[PDB]
Design a protein around this ligand. Structure first.
Ligand code: NI
Length: 209
C-alpha cells in the first residue's frame, strides 16, 4: 500500500525510520522494486543528497524521493508530515538546486527516453548492467542487448552506452560495428537526476572510423 527504502543512513538513523514505519503502518524493504513508493535520502540542511543507485531508480520510477528530515520531523511532531515539504533539491555532482524527482514524479506520461533504443555495452562496474537497463527502461527507453540487435527505420533512435575506464584494444571501434552514437554512463545518469535528455555532445566518445 506504501513501501520504502533508505539510502545513506546509519544503523541509528535507520532505527528511526523503522520507528516511523512501525507507527504510520508503512512497509519497509531492503531492495527497491516496482512497488517501493518512497525513497529516503540522507541530506544536508538544504536537501542535497549523494547520488546513489536508489536515488536514481527512485527518480526513474517517479516514486516519492524525500530527505531524511521528513522522518525526524514526523517523529518530532507525532504526525506524518508532507512528503512535498521535504523533497530532494539536488545532489553533490549535478548541483544543489535542480529539483529532479519532482519532475519525474509529475512527468510519467512523457518519459525522457520515450521511443529510444539503448544498449549498455560491455562490462559495467560501479553498477550492475541490468540495474542500469532497468533504469532506462523505466524512463521509456527500450533495451537492446546486442549491438547487432538495434531496430531499423527512423523515428526510432539508437544509442550505445559504455563505461570506458572499465575495459582493458578498442572500444572506440564501436561506430564501425554499428551506426549509433556512443556515450558514457554519465549521459544517462544526468539525464535521470535532472529528468531531461542531455547534449550527448558532452558525452560522445571517439569512434575509430
Ligand atoms: Ni532524429
Amino acid at each position: 500500500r506504501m513501501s520504502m527504502v533508505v539510502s545513506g543512513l546509519t544503523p541509528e538513523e535507520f532505527m528511526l525510520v523503522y520507528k516511523f514505519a512501525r507507527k504510520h503502518h508503512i512497509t519497509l524493504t531492503n531492495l527497491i522494486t516496482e512497488e517501493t513508493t518512497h525513497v529516503v535520502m540522507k541530506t544536508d540542511a538544504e536537501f542535497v543528497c549523494e547520488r546513489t543507485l536508489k536515488y536514481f531508480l527512485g527518480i526513474a520510477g517517479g516514486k516519492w524521493v524525500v530527505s531524511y528530515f521528513w522522518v525526524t520531523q514526523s517523529i518530532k511532531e507525532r504526525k506524518m508530515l508532507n512528503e512535498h515539504d521535504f523533497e530532494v533539491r539536488g545532489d553533490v555532482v549535478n548541483g544543489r538546486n535542480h529539483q529532479g524527482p519532482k519532475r519525474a514524479r509529475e512527468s510519467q506520461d512523457r518519459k525522457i527516453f520515450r521511443g529510444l533504443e539503448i544498449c549498455c555495452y560491455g562490462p559495467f562496474t560501479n553498477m550492475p548492467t541490468d540495474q542500469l537497463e532497468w533504469m532506462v527502461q523505466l524512463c521509456g527507453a527500450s533495451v537492446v542487448k546486442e549491438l547487432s540487435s538495434f531496430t531499423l527505420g527512423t523515428g526510432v533512435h539508437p544509442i550505445v552506452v559504455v563505461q570506458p575506464d572499465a575495459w582493458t584494444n578498442g572500444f572506440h571501434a564501436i561506430g564501425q560495428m554499428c551506426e549509433a552514437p556512443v556515450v558514457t554512463p554519465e549521459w544517462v545518469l544526468d539525464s535521470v537526476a535532472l529528468y531531461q535528455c542531455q547534449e550527448l555532445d558532452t558525452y560522445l566518445i571517439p569512434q575509430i572510423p
